[PDB]
RNA sequence: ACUAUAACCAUCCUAAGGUAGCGAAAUUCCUUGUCGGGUAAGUUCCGACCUGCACGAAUGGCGUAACGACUUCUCAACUGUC
RNA sequence: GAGAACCUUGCCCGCCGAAAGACCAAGGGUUCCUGGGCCAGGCCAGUCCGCCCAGGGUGAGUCGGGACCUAAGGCGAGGCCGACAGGCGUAGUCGAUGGACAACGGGUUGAUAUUCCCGUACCCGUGUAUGUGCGUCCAUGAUGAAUCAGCGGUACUAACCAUCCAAAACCACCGUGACCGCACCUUUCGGGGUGUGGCGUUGGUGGGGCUGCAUGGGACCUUCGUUGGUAGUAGUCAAGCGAUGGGGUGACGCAGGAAGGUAGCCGUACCGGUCAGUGGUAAUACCGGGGUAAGCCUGUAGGGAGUCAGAUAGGUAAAUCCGUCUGGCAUAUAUCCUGAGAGGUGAUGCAUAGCCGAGUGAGGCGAAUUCGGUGAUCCUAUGCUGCCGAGAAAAGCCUCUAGCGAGGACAUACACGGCCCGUACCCCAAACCAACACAGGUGGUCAGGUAGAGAAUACUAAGGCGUACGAGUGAACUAUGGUUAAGGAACUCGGCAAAAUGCCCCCGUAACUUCGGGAGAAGGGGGACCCACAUGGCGUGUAAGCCUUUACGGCCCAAGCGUGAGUGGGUGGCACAAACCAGUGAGAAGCGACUGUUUACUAAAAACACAGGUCCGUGCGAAGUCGCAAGACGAUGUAUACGGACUGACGCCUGC
RNA sequence: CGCGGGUAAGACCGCGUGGAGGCCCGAACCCACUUAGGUUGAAGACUGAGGGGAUGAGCUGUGGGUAGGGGUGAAAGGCCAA
């Protein structure tokens, strides 16, 4: 859910925060969190690589299991649902039946005290894991693998869903997230049902100082640098830069994909813009 | 006010960044000190 | 149907010829434009007229409660600023 | 002293007193103390000195560090990358601003003291002796675990129950790869292309089987579990250490009280003393004391915690430890852990108000030490309660087995060892950064009294200073304060600068509005002192009283202490927020939504940023970027995410 | 969150606890808007009066990193030892 503030304050007044509905736990496993420190934005050289990174709020990292394959036929139930920093969408915790704790991405429906069976027998509910062989064609998954055993990697976000259209060969063909079809290797697993968090876009958070809190630092347009800073600097008054748009880097605006790519030849097609 | 001067001294960062362990790490700077020599120098480094 | 105006029509041409909204404007040269308010007297100020030298819709258009060591004008109190 | 405003001693006056007092870190390096000097320096002279010379001074098992541990980061065996130079980086090894670890009070020198000495503690090791005291052989417990088989299905095998999907082709419909006459658009009509046609296949869509895909199981040899014997027979097994390994703990944010305490402060019981040449004041008034730690006992307020048994390979092997699953017993102020504080001890000691002679000052003696009130920004508290922005690692401590083991554990007494560096002095300043004995800068810890809300402000206690050119003199003039008749913005570019409002408690508050505001709006009234209500109300709380599961108990409470607010009467002055401190208010327009950032050293804005909007790119060692390359940030993220571009809350909108 | 009203339940309204905020006034702290002095100064950028923020996009110590056609830049051609 998504909870409004009311306008007691000028950078309070539009502002909105995340109902913490399916919270369950306020403090994370003790020996699945690992330290994490801020870079920046900064690569090992010492420079800055990525601008409008920096500051933020100190966090650690809670280690997520993408790679459920060790556990086959061992059944699990969500102990606990709680809420991750680094990640968008909330985190469960898994208490096997072995007896061993893990964190996955909490799909949408998932409820405390649900069973949640991996391998490739396991039934088609949401957070069950089964590789795409075993899949019906039609479904709806997440965390789909792209390589045969290189952990998840598509649709990890929240509120985010991969429709599997269906088999041929030895690939099956997904409908990304971002409406382009794509085949992958049907060896790989993947994850039945949405993600959790599906109200995350709707946050409005209010105020400049709320996005410093989450690690942004503010970014400065184009046409106020100097010609030198950046290719649109420059003119006496305001001007729209005098030039087809850049990055500032002086490279124009344009598809980047670079041509001639081993993996070119799985996707059936790319996302459309603009129909 | 503010007065701060350029120079607020400090012996640890001296010699973590003007010192001879630092001098004698690098090809630039083992020259340094050898060239200091040559002149005649009393303190070779920092 | 007197004067002016220009609804209207015609022309050329272009890819199209500025819709809503605002307008002597942080844009208006003529210019202290004209009418009205305010003062005993107001080249500044506020409201409108539109004849937009040379406004105009994300280089955003028109409004807007609250906020401003921002710019402009008036009043009450206060005083060696006079 | 030859020489004195500036040196020393005494008595007055004044200034700081959230400092201009006391203690540190960084920094400096002999500036510290004693003796000596007065051509150099001190913005003057100087007998003085942070100056010059000689001598002296810095004492640690417990304090800040190393010998213990890691973060950001640096270096980096091999290594990868790179014509050469070199770039990164694994294993490690460094790195406090953090984690872990054992000492407090008093005294002493001219200079050091948590270091020396006195009293009392604590923490690591070593040896000796004394027992307690369990063991290895010996023996106890050593009875008992493994095997032979059966059962009953894990179990490749062949296969079956067979199945998710549709592996692959089949068919068709649609669509049309080329092509063939022709239908169409047709160009006005013809062409010409397309293929709306023939197939067929650019192909797509659907269908069912062919069966495939993978998938287990039921389950067969096998393998193993269980049960039936096979020797309570072969193993096993027993004191004690026990990890470099496993696991717990270490282990963490911000905001906010409430509650209980203590430190401090203010009076008093009690003790010692004064008469401060004034009108009164001899105990009735006045002044000064009214102290004492770590540690060891005890475990209060508060906070927290279920316990027992079995199975179990998940914890790189094994685990009795940690998990997870089953059952039993549990809601007790039961038990255990933590823990402020009160109480005893430490303490027949130490120290102090004062009293003696003695005088540089050495020395001796040394009284009472109860009750309350107020009260913390400190302790309980790494707690509790809320919130989203989700809040270091490792050593350390505990436990588990793996493994070592015939000696080893516990207590008592005695004798011992405890390393290296720092330690003087200045440290908001004439000793550091500023060329100066410079109106600038410099992180942390202590926080007295009276007014006050306060760490502001005024005065002041402890303490520290009068800080290094003076002595005079009603000039103009400049600077900094103060006051002003009548008028009140006429001054001027402009109310620049000044003046004015200013506090507490009541009453009353407009247009507009995003329903929060606007708002301390504006505007109006009271404010001193004495008495009475009042032996009142309120907080606290002792005696007494009540109660209990009796204790470091609970309730209540005369007296005692402290304390508002109000009502009525009265007195004074020109003035009752009397000094210091302490909003000017209202109306309208432009720009920008707002809080913020910016040209160190003439520009703080209408500029930048901002939450919100849109567009473009990026399918993942992504796009973008730093690098010749490896590699790295992006991100330990995955299209509700990331990068770039423009606009800048919100409302109505965004034309051709 | 609780109580009362309200209702069929609601919506919502009053009273209690609670104490949020790039909230308010204001010292330390950090800035630098106005004015006057200084301008061979006490000072190679300060002083006296007023002034803005002052629980946050806050200020600060310690240790570390980014290097010259390069860094850093809430963007002024600013900062990188006067």
Not at chain 2, 1 to 24: D, I, S
Request: aromatic share 4%; with cysteine.
């Amino acid at each position: 859910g998504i909870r409004k503030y009311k306008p007691t304050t000028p950078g309070r007044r539009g502002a909105s925060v995340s109902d913490f509905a399916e919270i369950t736990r306020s403090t994370p496993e003790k020996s699945l969190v690992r330290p994490l420190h801020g870079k920046g934005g900064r690569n090992a050289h010492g420079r800055i690589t990525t601008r409008h990174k920096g500051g933020g709020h100190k966090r650690a990292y809670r280690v997520i299991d993408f790679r459920r394959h060790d556990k086959d036929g061992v059944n699990a139930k969500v102990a606990h649902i709680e809420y991750d920093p680094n990640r968008t969408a909330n985190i469960a915790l898994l208490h096997y039946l072995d007896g061993e704790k893990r964190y996955i991405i909490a799909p949408q429906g998932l409820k405390q005290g649900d069973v949640i069976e991996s391998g490739a027998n396991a039934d088609i509910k949401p957070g069950n894991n089964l590789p795409l062989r075993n899949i019906p064609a039609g479904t709806v998954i997440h965390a789909v693998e792209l390589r045969p055993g290189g952990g998840a990697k598509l649709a990890r976000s929240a509120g985010v869903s991969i429709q599997l259209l269906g088999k041929e060969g030895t690939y099956a063909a997904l409908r990304m997230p971002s409406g382009e079809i794509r085949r992958v290797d049907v060896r790989c697993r993947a994850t039945v049902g949405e993600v959790g968090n599906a109200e995350q876009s709707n946050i409005n958070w209010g105020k400049a100082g709320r996005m410093r809190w989450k690690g942004k630092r503010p970014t400065v347009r184009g046409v106020v640098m100097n010609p030198v800073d950046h290719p649109h600097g420059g003119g006496e008054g305001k001007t729209s830069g005098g030039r087809h748009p850049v990055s500032p880097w002086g490279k124009p605006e344009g598809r980047t994909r670079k041509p001639n790519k081993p993996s070119d030849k799985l996707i059936v097609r790319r996302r459309r813009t603009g129909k | 006010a503010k007065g701060k001067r350029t120079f607020q001294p400090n012996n640890r960062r001296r010699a973590r960044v003007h010192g001879f362990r630092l001098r004698m790490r690098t090809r630039a700077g083992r020259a340094i000190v050898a060239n200091r020599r040559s002149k005649g120098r009393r303190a070779l480094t920092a």
